[PDB]
């Protein structure tokens, strides 16, 4: 039903400064600065000081409030309150998505650019084609070891998407997927710290 007021809030640790200008949030932290645009015309984001713990003092928070509205549009407060939580975590403890390579018989060789801004996959299932797969902005690919890479970055929406672009370029076509279980997969997703 139509909630009179749906509220959410995210805590700001001591190392990050957040400034809002008409739902254009800019988050600054030790690893850098991140900016996003939350173009929902029915919510207001304003920083405030609210007591979060039951028996604690006031803490700097970002409060997202959506007033009278149906359950279709009231679901976005927690989505907005969680995209911000990934901009505070990202600039404080950066993201990292370790990625493995699985092959049956044909070895796969990955070529990483000098700056790490791009990758290159060769000899996938013996195919002579050489897929490139360029990364997004602010995402760096490095080779952890043998048959393993990890994508360092600050924006989860760009690190993870760049991690899903490598797997989408190494699919097996016209063959039984249940047996030709090759490609590159996301082993685990963690933080740099």
């Amino acid at each position: 039903p139509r909630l009179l007021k749906k509220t959410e809030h995210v805590v700001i640790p001591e190392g990050v400064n957040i400034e809002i200008n008409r739902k254009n949030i800019k988050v600054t932290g030790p690893r850098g600065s991140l900016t996003r645009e939350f173009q929902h015309p029915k919510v207001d984001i304003y920083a405030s000081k609210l007591v979060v713990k039951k028996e604690g003092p006031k803490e700097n928070v970002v409060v997202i409030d959506m007033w009278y509205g149906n359950r279709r549009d009231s679901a976005v407060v927690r989505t907005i309150a969680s995209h911000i939580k990934n901009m505070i975590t990202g600039v404080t403890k950066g993201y990292q998505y370790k990625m493995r390579v699985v092959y049956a018989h044909f070895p796969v060789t990955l070529v990483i650019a000098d700056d790490g801004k791009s990758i290159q996959v060769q000899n996938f299932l013996g195919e002579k084609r050489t897929r490139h797969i360029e990364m997004y902005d602010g995402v760096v690919v490095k080779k952890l070891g043998k048959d393993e890479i990890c994508l360092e970055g600050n924006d989860v929406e760009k690190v993870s998407q760049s991690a899903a672009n490598i797997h989408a370029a190494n699919l097996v076509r016209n063959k039984d997927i249940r047996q030709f279980l090759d490609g590159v997969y996301v082993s685990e997703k963690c933080l740099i710290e």
Binding site: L4, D44, Y46, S48, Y68
Partner: protein, 130 residues
């Protein structure tokens, strides 16, 4: 953060109706569209009645310590304790309502002098700046 909320005790300005441009005090919120304005009938003249939120306009004054369903005998004290009438007449809309009343009483001789005087003063202002 929103400054002016629709609560109990908020002083609202009835824009449309026979009581247009009169002060009313909310003493109940029936639902999201209807409130119970009781801008004390012995002070402003707005009787207690259910009105829509599409007729009233909010003002930045909240009468202090007003509970829902206040009587007329006790609401009149709080309204006159904070002197909303004194404070309302100093705001931008308070000076707009009194301006509308004066220009209504203007005759044709009074409309002729003001136009013939404003133009002289306005032109003299433009001369004074180089």
């Amino acid at each position: 953060v929103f400054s002016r909320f629709v609560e109990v005790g908020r002083v609202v300005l009835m824009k449309t109706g026979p009581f247009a441009s009169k002060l009313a005090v909310i003493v109940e919120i029936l639902d999201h569209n209807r409130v119970l304005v009781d801008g004390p009938q012995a002070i402003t003249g707005v009787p207690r009645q259910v009105v829509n939120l599409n007729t009233i306009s909010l003002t930045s004054f909240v009468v202090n310590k007003v509970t829902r369903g206040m009587t007329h005998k006790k609401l009149c004290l709080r309204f006159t304790q904070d002197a909303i009438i004194k404070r309302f007449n100093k705001t931008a809309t308070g000076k707009a309502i009194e301006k509308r009343i004066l220009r209504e009483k203007m005759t044709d001789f009074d409309k002729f002098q003001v136009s013939i005087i404003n133009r002289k003063i306005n032109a003299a202002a433009k001369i004074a700046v180089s």
